[PDB]
Ligand binder design. Structure first.
Ligand code: 2LL
Length: 113
């Protein structure tokens, strides 16, 4: 399968918009984690490949995703980073789990069509 980066933007962005629409749950994920602001100097040691909603959006806008699984992989990376770093009792971990539930519902059909 070959994929038109504009047809992939138009097909995938509604799945990304679905994540942005979650308030408060998307708020920690809208910009890159800043360990200095959050006071977590070990973050970049634990998380080798950061990802966040703004980075995925800019990649989608710059035609960075040759095929859609590459997009799906970045969304799951963002989730797995937050689950790795954060305690299970934490607000951000629980927010992550909510976003992943939203993403699974939204991406399911899209990757069918
Ligand atoms: C994602 C992610 N993965 O691990 C962590 C930690 C995060 C993360 C990532 C970001 C998180 C955040 C958690 N909690 C807040 C709000 C509470 C806060 C705590 C310390 C200092 C400031 C705020 N944010 C901040 C969200 N702001 C909202 C406004 O735009 C900038 C980020």
């Amino acid at each position: 399968k070959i994929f038109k980066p504009e047809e992939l933007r138009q097909a995938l962005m509604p799945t990304l918009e679905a994540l942005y629409r979650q308030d408060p749950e998307s708020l920690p994920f809208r910009q890159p984690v800043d360990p200095q602001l959050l006071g977590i100097p070990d973050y970049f040691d634990i998380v080798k490949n950061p990802m966040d909603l703004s980075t995925i959006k800019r990649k989608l806008d710059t035609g960075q995703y040759q095929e859609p699984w590459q997009y799906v992989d970045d969304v799951w990376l963002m989730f797995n980073n937050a689950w790795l770093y954060n305690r299970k009792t934490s607000r951000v971990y629980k927010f992550c789990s909510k976003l992943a539930e939203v993403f699974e519902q939204e991406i399911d059909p899209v990757m069918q069509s």
